[model samples]
Target: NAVYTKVDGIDVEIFENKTTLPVNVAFELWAKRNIKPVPEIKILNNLGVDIAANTVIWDYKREAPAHVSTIGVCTMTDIAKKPTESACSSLTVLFDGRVEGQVDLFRNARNGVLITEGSVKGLTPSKGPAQASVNGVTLIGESVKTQFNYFKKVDGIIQQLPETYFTQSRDLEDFKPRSQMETDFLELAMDEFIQRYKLEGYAFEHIVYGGLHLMIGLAKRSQDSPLKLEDFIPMDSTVKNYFITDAQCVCSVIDLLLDDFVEIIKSQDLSVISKVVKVTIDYAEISFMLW
Candidate 1:
């Protein structure tokens, strides 16, 4: 069965003696966006199945629902892709991450803040009809966008955006294109090199894109194509928000470098915001488990 959110026993009610507004309805002043938490995944079987011991209880103590993590034994799914086997479906979520190739490369950049005005991080490729092909091949592909729902959390209040808010076309290719990568590592490798280095004009990429990825002599903020906030932030944080992954000490390297970028700080020698800050990922994903 196709997966879906497991929400049961849902209900809502309006105040009694309803004080309703006529003509144009009016909600209370506190109306706003409310970013919901992505449920921690726990699975038991292969082929999009869910059993038990597949997840940890949602932990609020940590800033993120992700815990220290524990390695478990999973012998059900067959890794082989053959006539009788299939790539066991997975719910590998990014949280705030963009769906991409490598986990190490996809990382968190920033924690979302609550806001009244907002948008979506949608992921869909349902645009126009596919390009006509002479050989029954996709000559031209449709556009894809990943829209995320968000909300602000200031003063302990929350707000939300309209239903089904969507982002049309984000430059998703700018990140670690994992699908593209597997399609052809060489082609993707070349794309990785060009997007990370050659395409200086693209937004959200400055000296850093994610991981140890770096771009020297970043373009300054300008009107034709302004330097987005993600461009100024460190790679670790940028990846966190954009890719919606986690943290690492590699972040420190990016932070240290940020002190050098005028867009992020003043002087390279000074202990800027990154100094007081603390993030550690001594060993890269040395414990990644897949089922």
Candidate 2:
């Protein structure tokens, strides 16, 4: 079954009327749920880089009839695809976190100064689309250790244009045709990559165009063919975006790298923020759980 969140029995947007709480509130907060306490986190990954945990939390005590905190990575749904069309139209992501800190969700309400406080740390992707190292950002009064994965962007794509390009053509080898919607998806991805990771002319070293993955170059779009791109890392190649199951899956490979503690930060504030933290994993530890 699909997942959804509710507060006071009403399914509401998690961010609407929510406030991030201080780390001091963790203890009482977890007690309410009566689960294992937020353990001291340590994780080691396949990459051999040490990951640090950070902490953050949200309080809806005053804002909602009940309290809610520590949650989803939210849904990534294409604006171009409708839910009724297919399951591929939307993808659900999670920010699975195990914290080493504590806080309270409904500790004391009589004084009114402390409504509720929950804690969580932050994680930021510092490197790759397929694989990368993250920087952990801990809360003001907390240190966290967390691990999970999500989809992000590729670290490369050296060649890019200040003015974006778009196309609708669905063919790769055909190369002679294009469309705005297709280009729209490409530019959307391109723009996000630049905005989040790059500053040097906002160029990416590689990209997926149509069904083929192309290495991008520094050469600007030529004036003779406004719709065609003659410049690339591989040199002289054109590109487009379209509805291809294989291509979509290929693009999703890029999206799958969107890992780290990004959602924990974004859920707290509008200005999406993340920081580098360390996490410890037992590389030698392996176990299979029965569902």
Candidate 3:
């Protein structure tokens, strides 16, 4: 969503939500009943304990912020709206927790953060949804570095998916093995994951190992003969689970591989892609000043 006015004019669309409990008791009841395993939510933010929000994802409308912490639970209080259905569980509230301020949850809900102090030796002044603050109250980030390095930004996020046996750029058939699709998913995912971003605190070799497991698995699936390795087929479970069929897997492969790449190109900011060029410049200059 475009960050609109009424919000300090910074116009930044942060992915966060302040809940509007339906009567504290009702809200409590739902929270106590509905929340389910955070993993199932596939919370793009990955914050899975003692937090808030039903689900969070970057680009929910436009990719939720990456690497930001959030709150989510793994159980849902059993409750329902209708008797015939036996009721599910209380609906749990889920969303990203902005380190800055609680977002005005209900678009119509008014909300904000406030500055509680001036300045201190090692902090920044700020406030959030209900918590007020002052200068230097916030930690002065040490080792702080903000660069456009596609790799560095995506370092820890290179998760090896569990499938990968890509269509032969031209496979057309149905009845692909479930296992084969799973393997293709992991392999293609690994490729997309690796190409998606660069890594940090880790080497490419290590990362490759992490991804190889899935790719190899894909090969194993094809070896089983369900795929025939020669029969034409087009399907990737990763695509099937979320899209129309494996046909889109190839396109998706390309899509996931180019998140940051495309973002950079879409930018006209000379500084964002020009003088800075790569995150290396910023990483060296900014990352070194931690002292």
Candidate 4:
């Protein structure tokens, strides 16, 4: 079954039968089905000169019961010329039950350098002070120092994420657990996860682990076999319930990381790049509840 809805003046067809599709994936499918030739438009470059460029605009929204609801509009300019050399701007509004907020993102290339700037603003549910923050990053040729800046509000003030939150050095080895047995399991799971997704050459560029709260849990479906990531995969018959609770948690986490710049991903610009940057989860809590 399918339902038709209008989001940000865009017609969308949501298939209820494919319940397992992620929000971004569903939107991407719609985007592909409705692909049209992008028209050239006038836009200001770094030198404040108006240049003719092709731009793709996306405005969409996704919602789930008791989960975070997101509405966003993204614009990408001149991506067809050079996938990595483009200007993108996006505004995202988020609401998770009580608190509501918005994030603004702008990314562009200057003199072959990548620059990104972002800000966030929101009101807390407790009627406390409002939240706001700004961050900027300039990336030169594929240097190890290339990193995105993240900011958060604390004690009624906006602050950049502390350097301590960043990993000392970048490498997959950092994810290795101290325990030999756990390390073995992690390696196996990493291989499986990568293989399942067909991401062979992809490598992690950054790792940020910090926030008000962070928790990791381990679960086993069968003790007879080593723990694998696939163990968490629920059967098709149970996928609906699994998504409502477990998958929603995962979806929110993914949204927090990629939703701000989802348009870039949909455009397939990042695919040419070898390294992948992960989103930081400032606050995450996983709990199961009966509906």
Candidate 5:
């Protein structure tokens, strides 16, 4: 009777906490407080199957809409292939909890022979500032020039990709095939570069005529902040050449390690800048390729 109440002619049952003060202070207080049980957390695949244990979660602390716990990118392995052999499958979790796999997430339009722009959906931040930790592998196609820009949305308008994220023109022809000895030397040189620059999470791999891939894990450094999907949206008067490449291929990997580092300390910080400049120039002078 004490736990039952009549609400709008309906009988509702509720839990009651009955305890006395100072009898068992800790237990009594906990019992007296009306606290609901913690909700069960379950990560699901596109098929609504629970995959909490196997899923690799990232960017958990970054800001997103209130309703969205996080976005999950799904990949599939065929019957004769392993999961590692497959790229990201069509399945993608949108902000509104909708699982869309068949639909394309981006809209692209070609303006010139070497220039293109596009608008992307489902990647825009619902609120707060534009920031994201991007992670994806890209296969460079027949294109020689591999450079692109990702604009940030400002006040409902698209803005240019900041110069801080730009990369100096890299000539693909300059990167030639290497022998085993050259590979080892380049590995040592790259290792030294990583150690010298403290770029533990930054990784870059280039295969001559194969592709260029990178996996830049987010960290405290500004260089780790990858481009988000919303940066590709094109608007009136703000449209610019997003990708500068002649090949008919998708340029997914965007690395800003050098530019980000240079820009962060360029404000009268000559000592650090000089050290970075020298290291980069030295690294550039080394003629070696990862095949």
Candidate 6:
């Protein structure tokens, strides 16, 4: 699965999809029902001239244009499936209750803002995705400050994950409650939850707590314990029920984690890892607010 956008009027792949949904419904249902608790998006004020495809960062710098009155929600809609079938969302900046014309969504980070006209004045003629003219008002943006920071650019992202834990580095046979491996696994699971770009505004701490159970399940797997669905589920029965489908999605994700661990051991690539665990949120804030 992938999220796509357009470049120079052509469709392009943005990043790998992070949820589990029917393949046929992926394109239409994405951003609607595919992801539970969608990513938090905001609008950037102080329309900057530096907006472009090659811009690395998206924020007000020294060269940015002056500010206006307010910061509003920049609407992203209309999936235009080009010949290549790019899953791009049409972006429009709205202020108060009117359409402010086409705008750009800086892919800087999860909380990245868009430079747009608020109320008082007009911005310098700008370039990039948010530069289309509206009602004879050609908002000028000097250059784009955002290139493709969507995934590569991050804010408060989970960092420095444990490089060597599930491998032969620790004693998996004689596991204790707070053994070195257990401690590392708990931290690893928490950071894994934090690393996802989508969970920025949602209650991530609750996911971290539930991830504690997942760590326990993995520890049991290390000890040759039965890999039951209950072992891999959260302590909260209702929360466990929330992420359930007709199939065993929770169990399957844990199974993938075990498989990734085995692959890590076989490949001996502790320096590099991949996403394995996939979970959702339900009434987050009961656990932690590390986000």
TM-score of each: 0.18, 0.15, 0.18, 0.22, 0.19, 0.19
Clashes of 3: 45
For model 6, residues 172-201, the per-residue Cα lDDT tens digits are 234344344445544455455334322333
lDDT (Cα, tens digit) per residue for candidate 3, span 1-291: 222345675654432333322233223333333222121112112212222333222211122221132333222322322211211112222322222232223121111111122222333332221111111121122343111011100111222222111121112223232333333444455455434343222232221222111223333344344332221333222221211122112222111112222233233242221222222111121111110
- Candidate 4, residue 107: Cα displacement in angstroms equals 16
lDDT of 2 by residue, 1-291 (tens): 123368678754332222243222333343333222221111112222111111222122122212232221111212222111232212211112233121121111111011012332232222111111122211112232222222121121111112211111122233321234323334455456435532223111232222233322111121113233221221101222222232112221111011221222132323222222222112212221100
Q: What is the C-alpha lDDT of each candidate?
A: 0.23, 0.22, 0.24, 0.24, 0.24, 0.27
RMSD of each candidate relative to the true structure:
22.9, 22.0, 21.6, 19.5, 21.5, 20.4
lDDT of 1 by residue, 126-217 (tens): 21211211121212323422122233222223223222211111222232222332223223343464454333233323233323322221
* Clash number by candidate, in order: 36, 59, 45, 0, 0, 19
Instruction: List residue ranges in candidate 3 displaced over 4 A.
Output: 1-45, 49-93, 96-102, 105-212, 215-224, 227-291
Q: Which prediction has the highest lDDT against the true structure? A: 6
Q: Where's the lowest-lDDT run of ten residues in candidate 1?
A: 282-291
After TM-score superposition, what is the CA distance of residue 18 in candidate 5 from its true location, in Å?
A: 41
Q: How high is the lDDT of residue 264 in model 2?
A: 20
Question: Could you tell me how far off, in angstroms, the CA of residue 99 lies in candidate 1 after the best superposition?
Answer: 28
Model 2, TM vs. native: 0.15
